[PDB]
Amino acid sequence: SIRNGVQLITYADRLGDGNIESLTNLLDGPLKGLFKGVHILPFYYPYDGEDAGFDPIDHTTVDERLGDWNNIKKLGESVDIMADLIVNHMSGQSEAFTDVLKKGRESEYWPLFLTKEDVFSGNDQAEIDEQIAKVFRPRPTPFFSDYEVGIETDSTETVPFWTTFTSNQIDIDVESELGKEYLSSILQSFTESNVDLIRLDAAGYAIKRAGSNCFMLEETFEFIEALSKRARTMGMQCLVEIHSHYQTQIDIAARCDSVYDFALPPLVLHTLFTKDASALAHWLSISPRNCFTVLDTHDGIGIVDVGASGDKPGLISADAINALVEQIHVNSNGESKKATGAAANNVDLYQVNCTYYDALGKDDFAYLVARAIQFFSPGIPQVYYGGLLAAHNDMELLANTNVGRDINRPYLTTAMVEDAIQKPVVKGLMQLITLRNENKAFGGAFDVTYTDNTLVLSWSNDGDAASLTVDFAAMDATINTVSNGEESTLSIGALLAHHHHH
């Protein structure tokens, strides 16, 4: 149901001249023939709030500055589309919540939102607080937000609403009938708009049980599967997004349709920094196959994704993680330090804000080797729009907005795309994308080998075959293919040289 090929991650306004139609034109011209799918980052009203699309006021409507649902429908006629579903909460400025403020318990939308009384039914405030302490929260934001409701009636009441993220995001009761209707209505627009893939956001929080940590409970999995089952009947498929310890990604992927591979970004950097693919080869021996792979995302480079968690070990040692973080700062000449928040130890760093290209010191050969490793690992490969064009760290935008992640969210106009696709490293990347799109071997069986400083990633399907051999002693990377009756050998170094001369 999903086209096996390379996908693009983009904002609808930051690649092209600023709207969906402009992006569609790009995918029809300069970027034609590259992507079987496109993850369009949150495009709902509004896309340019405090959390860059992930805090929409009205999740049910496209931001009219970007277009409408028919623009999405048109773009998805020929390519798979991935779109975001924020399942856990709604905006305090949404029409449903403002109605609750106006009419209180007389509101039609009252059961839609999660309050303190919905979860804790006792009256021992000391006991309720001891159980509130067990709830897992990402930031020291308010636990409840006390809104006055019924302001347009003769009765008022102050209600503590559950607010996991900010006081302007009200957690909804996804177990109520209204909550299922709200989520179903967005899925409805999706399937009517040729959306194929649903990235579920904050789903790990969506189910609350007093006494538990309210995070990825068994009841949370049951909710996720009920949501995913509905999405499947509507012709779509779900992706459970999370940044966690690697064993949690494995556990989720065994029960859910898809996960991200967030181990590859730091492991591939570490592999290239140290010329040791032991940890990379270990991961590929156990990694979920139902995944979407990335090097860069719209966020920063996740580090805790391969680090320890409590008593559980990481995929590389603490020493390797600290040396990986430090090498990124060295390769970006300190630019990533400017964009990344302070931390006592790098082993505790959530994310390093830096382009993947700058994390590799803008080494064109290593970067093409990195993306070849990504394409030859199992799962659907996604290419971030910035990394597709080898965009450097955007220090100007960083200084302007003071938002750490903007170092990796450049505004790349149609004109800048036309220039960037002329760069040899970009031309080399597009040739790799074409190989990954057209060889049927990736639809078959996988094997990973690491002996004598030589990593081999092999695929075979029907009569087609494709293998990536990375010799770290010789610093050579070679792709061998069988297809169309042809046997072909593509040296990555020869690939990059060819595009410098021709």
* Six token digits for residue 39: 């993850």
Among 16, 53, 76, 404, binds Mg ion (CB under 5 A): 76
Q: Which amino acid is at 347?
A: V
Contact 488, 434 (CB under 8 A): no
| 136-175 footprint of Mg ion as x/- string (CB under 5 A) | ----------------------------------------
Among 153, 166, 189, 290, binds Cl ion (CB under 5 A): 290
Pick the stretch among 20-28, 288-296, 398-406, 494-502 that binds Cl ion (CB under 5 A).
288-296
Considering the candidates 201, 296, 358, 364, report the single residue annotated as catalytic.
201
Of 354, 351, 338, nearest in space to 387 by CA: 354
Q: Which does 194 bind (CB under 5 to 8 A by kind): Cl ion, Mg ion, none?
A: Mg ion
* Six token digits for residue 439: 């060889």
Q: Minimal distance in Å, beta carbon 87 to Cl ion?
A: 19
By CB under 5 A, tell whether 480 contacts Cl ion.
no
Say which residues have a Cβ less than 8 Å from residue 384's Cβ, sequence separation at least 6: 9, 10, 294, 295, 296, 297, 298, 356, 408
Query: Which one, 9 or 325, has the nearer CB to Cl ion?
Result: 9
Considering the candidates 171, 241, 299, 464, report the single residue annotated as catalytic.
241
Q: Which does 76 bind (CB under 5 to 8 A by kind): Cl ion, Mg ion, none?
A: Mg ion
Query: What is d(CA 87, CA 187) in angstroms, rounded to the nearest whole number?
Result: 11
Query: Which one, 194 or 258, has the nearer CB to Cl ion?
Result: 258
Look at residue 487 and give its three-state secondary structure: strand
Query: Which one, 39 or 59, has the nearer CB to Cl ion?
Result: 39
Query: How far is residue 63 from each of residues 2, 46, 69, 167, 351, measured CA to CA in Å?
Result: 27, 6, 10, 23, 29
* Six token digits for residue 239: 């992706």
Q: Minimal distance in Å, beta carbon 35 to Cl ion?
A: 16
Total chain residues near Mg ion (CB under 5 A): 4
Q: Which does 290 bind (CB under 5 to 8 A by kind): Mg ion, Cl ion, none?
A: Cl ion
As a three-state string, the secondary structure of 101-169 is: HHHHHHCCCHHHECEHHHHCCCCCHHHHHHHHHHCCCCCCCCCEEEEEECCCCCCCEEEEEECCCCCCE
Q: Which does 274 bind (CB under 5 to 8 A by kind): Cl ion, Mg ion, none?
A: none
| Residues in 215-244 that interact with Cl ion by CB under 5 A | none
By CB under 5 A, tell whether 5 contacts Mg ion.
no
By CB under 5 A, tell whether 194 contacts Mg ion.
yes
DSSP-derived secondary structure for 451-464: ETTEEEEEEEETTE
Say which residues have a Cβ less than 8 Å from residue 386's Cβ, sequence separation at least 6: 296, 355, 408, 409, 410, 412
Strand-strand pairing, 259-261 and 291-293: parallel
Among 258, 346, 355, 467, binds Cl ion (CB under 5 A): 258
Query: What is d(CA 445, CA 170) in angstroms, rounded to the nearest whole number?
Result: 45
Q: Minimal distance in Å, beta carbon 282 to Cl ion?
A: 21
Q: Which does 480 bind (CB under 5 to 8 A by kind): Mg ion, Cl ion, none?
A: none
Q: Minimal distance in Å, beta carbon 27 to Mg ion?
A: 12
Of 429, 426, 464, 430, nearest in space to 445 by CA: 464
Q: Minimal distance in Å, beta carbon 43 to Mg ion?
A: 15
Look at residue 246 and give its three-state secondary structure: helix
Q: Active-site residue 201, yes or no?
A: yes
* Six token digits for residue 291: 């995944």
Query: Which one, 190 or 273, has the nearer CB to Mg ion?
Result: 190
By CB under 5 A, tell whether 71 contacts Mg ion.
no
Burial class (CB in 10 A: 0-12, 13-18, 19+), 368: buried
Q: Active-site residue 124, yes or no?
A: no
By CB under 5 A, tell whether 94 contacts Cl ion.
no
Query: Which one, 3 or 282, has the nearer CB to Cl ion?
Result: 3
Pick the stretch among 129-137, 257-265, 293-301, 330-338 that binds Cl ion (CB under 5 A).
257-265
Q: Minimal distance in Å, beta carbon 14 to Mg ion?
A: 22
Query: Which one, 124 or 192, has the nearer CB to Mg ion?
Result: 192
* Helices and strands of the chain, counted as H and E runs: 19, 21
Query: Which one, 62 or 435, has the nearer CB to Mg ion?
Result: 62
| 295-314 footprint of Mg ion as x/- string (CB under 5 A) | --------------------
Look at residue 368 and give its three-state secondary structure: helix
In the complex, which residues of this chain contact Cl ion (CB under 5 A)?
258, 290
Active site residues: 201, 241
In the complex, which residues of this chain contact Mg ion (CB under 5 A)?
76, 81, 194, 196
